[PDB]
Design a protein around this nucleic acid. Structure first.
Ligand code: CL
Ligand code: NA
Ligand code: NA
Ligand code: NA
Ligand code: NA
Lengths: 459, 216
DNA sequence: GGGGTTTTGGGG
DNA sequence: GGGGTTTTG
DNA sequence: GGGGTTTTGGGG
C-alpha cells in the first residue's frame, strides 16, 4: 500500500488511492435511503491545512472525505477532532473547487482510526489503555493490517497533528456561528462552546447547557448512547444545529440525526483558550428562581472540589443494587444527582435538634437549650431520572452530628425556634429544594444502610 | 408568542390537568396542517412539530363519503383541514408509543377533516416529534412532578425520621439500603399512577384497519 | 453465487 | 457531498 | 479484476 499526501493525490488518475489524515470535522453516520448510510468528514495533513494566509485570516484549508456503506456499523464514529484516519482505495475528484475523496466501503474501500492522544475517546470513557501506539481503535471490515513502514507515517502524523492543533485553531471562525447570532441564520449552522452543565433529563437523554465565546447560553438535547463523551467543563464543536423558534422559555439548539458533537485533542489551542475564557453562568438560574415555574433546571448545590472527579451513581443503583453489585458494595462514598420531593420533618423549625453525644439521642429545642449540642437532622425524600417512573421515593439524610454536611445550608445549626434569621433562610431553601426543576448534586456516604450527605453546599 | 399551534395546544392541555374545556377558546379553531406521513404512521405537522391524529370511526366514514376519490392512507405530502377536533390525555407505554413521553400522551381526536387536494404549502423547518422537544418534555415533567409531590405529601406523614442513633455510632452496625425506600402513593402496581386528571376515553381506529378498509 | 463494477467472460 | 432514516431515544 | 467464498467455472 502506497500512501499519498492530500494535496499531492492525483485528480486525474481516478484510481483508488490511500492516505493517512487528521479529522477536524465529521458528521454522525446517517441513513439516507432504505439502503445507504453516509458519513462526511473534513481532513487535513502537512500538505493541506491552511488557506493562503495574508487575506485568508488564518482560515483552515482542508479536504473532504465521504464514506459510503450499506450498514451503519461500517462507518466511523468521530467523537473527537484531532484523531487520525487511514483510508484504503479512495477516489479523488474536484467538487466545487475543493478536493473530495470518495470511498465505497460497501465495495472495496476501508478506513481505520488512530488515537492521536494516549487513549481514544472510548478508552477514556471506559478508563482503558490502548493496545499499542499502532493499534486502530476502530476500523472497517473484520481485519486491519499495519505494515512496519506505516509506523513512521503514523508517528510523524501524530507529531504533526499536535503541532497543528496547538499552533492553530483548526476550527477557524468561518467554521461556525456565534450563539448570539444563531437566530439570524437561514438554516443549520455549526457551534463551538463550553459545556457548562450536563443535565440527565431522562433515561436516554442528556440536556447540555452550552456557552460559547459570545457569552450566550443555549441548551440542547444530546442522547446518552449517541454522544457518551460529553463532560462538563470541556469544549466541543457541534456540527449542524438549528435555532429553535418554538422554545420560548429558553434558548434551544435542535440537532439532526446527522448532527455531531466533537471534542478536541488535548493539544487543541482553541479548546484550551475557550476552557479558560468562557466562565460558568448562573443568570438563567437566578432569573428562574423568581418564576413560580421554571422550565430550566437549576442545580442548587456543589460538591467539594476534591470530589469533582468522582463519578455519579444513580438512585436506582444506590438503593436497588448497592447491596448486590460487587462494585457498589466496595464503596462507601458516592456522588449522585436528584430532586427533592419532600423534606422531613415538615416543620422547618425542627430541622435543628439538640443532640446528646453520650446517649445518642436528639430532641426538640422547643423547650430550649436543655437538649445538648445543636445539629441538623433533616431527611430528604428524593427521586431521579433512573427511578422517574417507579412508585418510589428514596431517603437521603443530612444528619450533621458528626460533621457530615454541617455547612450544607450555609446556615450554622441553631435553635430555629429562636433565631428568626436562621429559620427564614432554611424555610426559603426548603421552597427551592422542593420546587420543580430543582436538582441536587451531592456526595453521600453510606452508613448502616443509609446515605448521609457530605461535602455538598447550596449555592 | 408560541408559533407552533400544536405545541401551544398540547402544552395548555397539560398545564390544565388535561381538561380540554379549560384550554383557551381562541385555540379551538380549525387546524390546517400538512400531512408528513400517512402510513404506517399518520403524522401531521403545524410547520414546526408533528403529531399523530386519532380518527374516530365517524370521521373516516364521513371522509370516505364526501371524498370517494380519496384514500386517507395515500394523503402523504398532501394537506388536510381538521374542522372538528378535541384533545384528551391517555396513559400509554412510551417505550412502544413514540408519540408520547413518560407514559403520558396528549391525543388529537379528529372528528371531521377535509383533504385540500393539491394545495402547495409554504416551505418550513424539518418537523420534529413534539414529544421529543426539550420544553415540552419539561412541561410534561412538571405535570408529573406536581402529581407526584401532591401524592407523597398525602401519603408520607408522621415525620418517620431515621433514628439518629442508627447513623451515629454505626461501627458495629450494618444495614440494607432498601431500608431507605418509601412508597410515593397508594398506587396498586410498581409504577406511580396517582393522577387527578380523568383519563379521556374515546373509541379510535387503528391505522391498519383503515388500510384494509381501503385495500384488503 | 452474487455486489460492485465494467472485467461485460473469466483467476486463484 | 452542508446531509433527512427509523422494526421512530 | 479482484473479495470472500466454495461457486472451484460462469450471471446480470
Ligand atoms: Cl451499611
Ligand atoms: Na464478477
Ligand atoms: Na462483473
Ligand atoms: Na469464486
Ligand atoms: Na468471482
Amino acid at each position: 500500500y502506497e500512501y499519498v499526501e492530500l494535496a499531492k493525490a492525483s485528480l486525474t488518475s481516478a484510481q483508488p488511492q490511500h492516505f493517512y489524515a487528521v479529522v477536524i470535522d465529521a458528521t454522525f453516520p446517517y441513513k439516507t435511503n432504505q439502503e445507504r448510510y453516509i458519513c462526511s468528514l473534513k481532513i487535513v495533513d502537512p500538505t493541506l491545512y491552511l488557506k493562503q494566509q495574508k487575506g485568508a485570516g488564518d482560515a483552515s484549508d482542508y479536504a473532504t472525505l465521504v464514506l459510503y456503506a450499506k450498514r451503519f456499523e461500517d462507518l466511523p464514529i468521530i467523537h473527537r477532532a484531532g484523531d487520525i484516519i487511514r483510508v484504503h482505495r479512495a477516489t479523488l475528484r474536484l467538487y466545487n473547487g475543493q478536493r473530495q475523496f470518495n470511498a465505497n466501503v460497501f465495495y472495496s474501500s476501508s478506513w481505520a482510526l488512530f488515537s492521536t492522544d494516549k487513549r481514544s475517546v472510548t478508552q477514556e470513557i471506559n478508563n482503558q489503555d490502548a493496545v499499542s501506539d499502532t493499534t486502530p481503535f476502530s476500523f472497517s471490515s473484520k481485519h486491519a493490517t499495519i505494515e512496519k513502514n506505516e509506523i513512521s507515517i503514523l508517528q510523524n502524523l501524530r507529531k504533526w497533528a499536535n503541532q497543528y492543533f496547538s499552533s492553530y485553531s483548526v476550527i477557524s471562525s468561518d467554521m461556525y456561528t456565534a450563539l448570539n447570532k444563531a437566530q439570524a441564520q437561514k438554516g443549520d449552522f455549526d457551534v463551538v462552546a463550553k459545556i457548562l452543565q450536563v443535565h440527565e433529563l431522562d433515561e436516554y437523554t442528556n440536556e447540555l447547557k452550552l456557552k460559547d465565546a459570545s457569552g450566550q447560553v443555549f441548551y440542547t438535547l444530546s442522547l446518552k448512547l449517541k454522544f457518551p463523551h460529553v463532560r462538563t467543563g470541556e469544549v466541543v464543536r457541534i456540527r449542524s444545529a438549528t435555532y429553535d423558534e418554538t422554545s420560548t422559555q429558553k434558548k434551544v439548539l435542535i440537532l439532526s440525526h446527522y448532527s455531531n458533537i466533537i471534542t478536541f485533542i488535548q493539544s487543541s489551542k482553541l479548546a484550551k483558550e475557550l476552557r479558560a475564557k468562557i466562565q460558568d453562568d448562573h443568570s438563567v438560574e437566578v432569573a428562574s428562581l423568581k418564576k413560580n415555574v421554571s422550565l430550566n433546571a437549576v442545580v442548587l448545590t456543589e460538591v467539594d472540589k476534591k470530589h469533582a472527579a468522582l463519578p455519579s451513581t444513580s438512585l436506582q443503583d444506590l438503593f436497588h443494587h448497592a447491596d448486590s453489585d460487587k462494585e457498589l458494595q466496595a464503596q462507601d462514598t458516592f456522588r449522585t444527582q436528584f430532586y427533592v420531593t419532600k423534606i422531613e420533618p415538615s416543620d422547618v423549625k425542627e430541622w435543628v435538634k439538640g443532640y446528646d453525644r453520650k446517649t445518642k439521642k436528639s430532641s426538640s429545642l422547643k423547650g430550649a437549650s436543655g437538649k445538648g449540642d445543636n445539629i441538623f437532622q433533616v431527611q430528604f425524600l428524593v427521586k431521579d431520572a433512573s427511578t422517574q417512573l417507579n412508585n418510589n421515593t428514596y431517603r437521603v439524610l443530612l444528619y450533621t452530628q458528626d460533621g457530615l454536611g454541617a455547612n450544607f445550608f450555609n446556615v450554622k445549626a441553631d435553635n430555629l425556634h429562636k433565631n428568626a434569621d436562621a429559620r427564614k433562610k432554611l424555610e426559603d431553601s426548603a421552597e427551592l429544594l422542593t420546587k420543580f426543576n430543582s436538582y441536587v448534586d451531592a456526595v453521600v456516604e453510606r452508613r448502616n444502610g443509609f446515605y448521609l450527605i457530605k461535602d455538598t453546599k447550596l449555592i | 408568542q408560541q408559533q407552533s399551534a400544536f405545541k401551544q395546544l398540547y402544552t395548555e392541555l397539560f398545564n390544565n390537568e388535561g381538561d380540554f374545556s379549560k384550554v383557551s377558546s381562541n385555540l379551538k379553531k380549525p387546524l390546517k396542517c400538512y400531512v408528513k406521513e400517512s402510513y404506517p404512521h399518520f403524522l401531521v405537522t403545524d410547520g414546526y412539530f408533528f403529531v399523530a391524529p386519532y380518527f374516530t370511526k365517524e370521521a373516516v366514514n364521513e371522509f370516505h363519503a364526501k371524498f370517494p376519490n380519496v384514500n386517507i392512507v395515500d394523503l402523504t405530502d398532501k394537506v388536510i383541514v381538521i374542522n372538528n377536533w378535541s384533545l384528551e390525555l391517555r396513559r400509554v407505554n412510551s417505550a412502544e408509543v413514540f408519540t408520547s413521553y413518560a407514559n403520558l400522551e396528549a391525543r388529537l381526536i379528529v372528528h371531521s377533516f377535509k383533504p385540500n387536494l393539491q394545495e402547495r404549502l409554504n416551505p418550513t423547518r424539518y418537523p420534529v416529534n413534539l414529544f421529543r422537544d426539550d420544553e415540552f418534555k419539561t412541561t410534561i415533567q412538571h405535570f408529573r412532578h406536581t402529581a407526584l409531590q401532591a401524592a407523597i405529601n398525602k401519603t408520607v406523614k408522621g415525620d418517620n425520621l431515621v433514628d439518629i442513633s442508627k447513623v451515629a455510632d454505626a461501627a458495629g452496625k450494618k444495614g440494607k439500603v432498601d431500608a431507605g425506600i418509601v412508597k410515593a402513593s397508594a398506587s396498586k402496581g410498581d409504577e406511580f399512577s396517582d393522577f387527578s386528571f380523568k383519563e379521556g376515553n374515546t373509541a379510535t381506529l387503528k391505522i391498519a384497519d383503515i388500510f384494509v378498509q381501503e385495500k384488503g
